Amino acid sequence: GDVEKGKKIFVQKCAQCHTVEKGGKHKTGPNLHGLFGRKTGQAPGFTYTDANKNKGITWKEETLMEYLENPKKYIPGTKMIFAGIKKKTEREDLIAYLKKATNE
């Protein structure tokens, strides 16, 4: 749907671990550092599991769609204790938000 819907639901279910949106930080997932077009294996010392970075899958709409719907299927060894959002429109709105969040 919208950018707004994505940042607001991110700040509810995601900033809870990935505190990118204010004071860029990483409590139990990395800061989403400029993701759309970039690689994994990039957090400043946030010591996550080997297999994510090692799989190298490149972050974009497709790969973050397959990932945030189905993470441990899409890339093995992901420790993301959440596995899915709720509404497929929050899923849209996250793509709409994170498409912007590396430029706006």
Residue ranges that bind ligand HEC, judged by CB under 6 A: 10, 13-14, 16-18, 28-30, 32, 35, 40, 42, 48-49, 52, 64, 68, 78-82, 85, 94
The CB-of-48 to ligand HEC minimum distance in angstroms stands at: 4
Position of tokens 């990395």?
Answer: 30
b/e burial code for range 34-65 (CB count within 10 A of at least 16 → b): ebbeeebeebeeeebeeebbeeebebeeebbe
Ramachandran region of residue 26, left (φ > 0), alpha (ψ -120 to 50) or beta?
beta
Binding residues for heme c: 14, 17-18, 80
- Give min distance, CB of 79 to ligand HEC, in A: 4
Q: How far is the CB of 75 from ligand HEC (least distance, A)?
A: 6
List residues forming the annotated binding site. Answer: 14, 17-18, 80
Q: Closer to ligand HEC at the Cβ: 49 or 70? A: 49
Task: Select 42 or 89, whichever has its Cβ closest to ligand HEC.
Answer: 42
Distances in Å between the Cα of 19 and the Cα atoms of 24, 30, 33, 71 are 6, 8, 11, 19
Q: Are 66 and 78 in contact (CB under 8 A)?
A: no
Minimum gap (Å) between residue 3 Cβ and ligand HEC: 14
